[PDB]
């Protein structure tokens, strides 16, 4: 009875969230594609810092394209079947997720180095950190999933296992190191380089300002994955819709960020 009509209402709001989520991901993917070809066209594609931007954009394209494939594994039949291609899709998606953190760390490392030390050879260091280091981490995590949690296409939540820390711990650690980089960049920009106007100084204050704007935008998304929303109807629907808008436009925000630093 009145339970069922309360159940039908939720299906609407969940179905609405799903539509926000598909829309945002399509807009983000087109925005990253447009930003990618813009970078590839410029002659400035040979400067180290534009190599870093374009690889960063590529890493986000792969993650956002893979999200669509992931949606085809959230079928209950597929999810319980734990078929092989089903686990390979989940691992590829987590790999790309780890490369997103490690390329942002790549951006932080370059910015800290550019103001402290006066291109195609040096790039290999960033390629190795951004695409390379996550590969053994994901392999390690997959060996973990095999012997201790081989279910649900490896996308299960099961209380007590920490197999996912194998790839989540490295993520938090490079974020922690980027925080140290940021304090020293601000520290250096505000003591020694207060009166400076080297080209790499102007463009560095632009980065710091843009990073300070982006950081809260992206930060809320990850802290909300820890909140228990609550049973208030107003509380649930708003939690569900705010989260779906922020998660799904992440790719859009990053493409804006990257194009801004092209200037």
């Amino acid at each position: 009875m009145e339970i069922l009509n309360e159940e039908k209402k939720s299906k609407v709001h969940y179905h609405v969230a799903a539509i926000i989520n598909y829309l945002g991901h399509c807009i983000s993917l087109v925005a990253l594609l447009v930003a990618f070809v813009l970078f590839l066209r410029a002659r400035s594609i040979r400067c180290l810092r534009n190599i870093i931007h374009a690889n960063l954009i590529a890493a986000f394209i792969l993650r956002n394209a893979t999200w669509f494939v992931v949606q085809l594994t959230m079928s209950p039949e597929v999810h319980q079947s734990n078929v092989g291609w089903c686990r390979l899709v989940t691992a590829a998606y987590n790999y790309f997720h780890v490369t997103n953190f490690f390329w942002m760390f790549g951006e932080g490392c370059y910015l800290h180095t550019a103001i402290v030390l006066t291109d195609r050879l040096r790039a290999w260091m960033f390629i190795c950190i951004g695409w390379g280091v996550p590969f053994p981490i994901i392999v390690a995590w997959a060996i973990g999933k095999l012997y201790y949690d081989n279910e649900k296409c490896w996308a299960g939540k099961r209380p007590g296992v920490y197999t996912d820390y194998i790839y989540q711990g490295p993520m938090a650690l490079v974020l922690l190191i980027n925080f140290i980089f940021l304090f020293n960049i601000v520290r250096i920009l505000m003591t020694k380089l207060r009166a400076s106007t080297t080209s790499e100084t102007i463009q560095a204050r632009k980065a710091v300002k843009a990073t300070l704007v982006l950081l809260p935008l992206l930060g809320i998304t990850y802290m909300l994955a820890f909140v228990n929303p609550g049973e208030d109807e107003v509380s649930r629907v708003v939690f569900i819709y705010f989260n779906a808008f922020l998660e799904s436009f992440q790719g859009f925000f990053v493409s804006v960020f990257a194009c801004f630093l092209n200037s």
Partner: protein, 160 residues
């Protein structure tokens, strides 16, 4: 950028070492003293580094020595009548490639590339590049030489 350029094609050492002839050196090829005693080697060092006495330096420390050697090198470039005018005419990137050559072969070594130098001062960089490559220099360290030459030809950092 110029620090990373020379780090790349010469190398970086953080603890004092003796060079091929036996003198005490550190950083990117900064000679400390032909005095054979380490006493004078580490002494001259801290007088320079003006830090807590030691034989290991900071990556930070190396760049401050490196900047001293860059100064001495540009001083020598401007004192040389075949090199002064080429240098004065070049942009910042291409000046860096000229400083690179002086680190490897000295001022009088570079002054010997008379044809190429006139190419460069005529901002005629294609045909300078072919001259620089018909030389014993190109033949002996060909990877370093290709990087330095491409930097002359384009005026960018793209090769490093």
């Amino acid at each position: 950028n110029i620090f990373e350029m020379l780090r790349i094609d010469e190398g970086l050492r953080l603890k004092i070492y003796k060079d091929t002839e036996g003198y005490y050196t550190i950083g990117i090829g900064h000679l400390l003293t032909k005095s054979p005693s380490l006493s004078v080697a580490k002494s001259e060092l801290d007088k320079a580094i003006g830090r807590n006495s030691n034989g290991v330096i900071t990556k930070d420390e190396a760049e401050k020595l490196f900047n001293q050697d860059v100064d001495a090198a540009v001083r020598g470039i401007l004192r040389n009548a075949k090199l002064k005018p080429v240098y004065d005419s070049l942009d910042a990137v291409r000046r860096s490639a000229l400083i690179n050559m002086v680190f490897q072969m000295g001022e009088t070594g570079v002054a010997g590339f008379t044809n190429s130098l006139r190419m460069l001062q005529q901002k005629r960089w294609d045909e300078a590049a072919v001259n620089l490559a018909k030389s014993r220099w190109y033949n002996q360290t060909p990877n370093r030489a290709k990087r330095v030459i491409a930097t002359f030809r384009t005026g960018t950092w793209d090769a490093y």
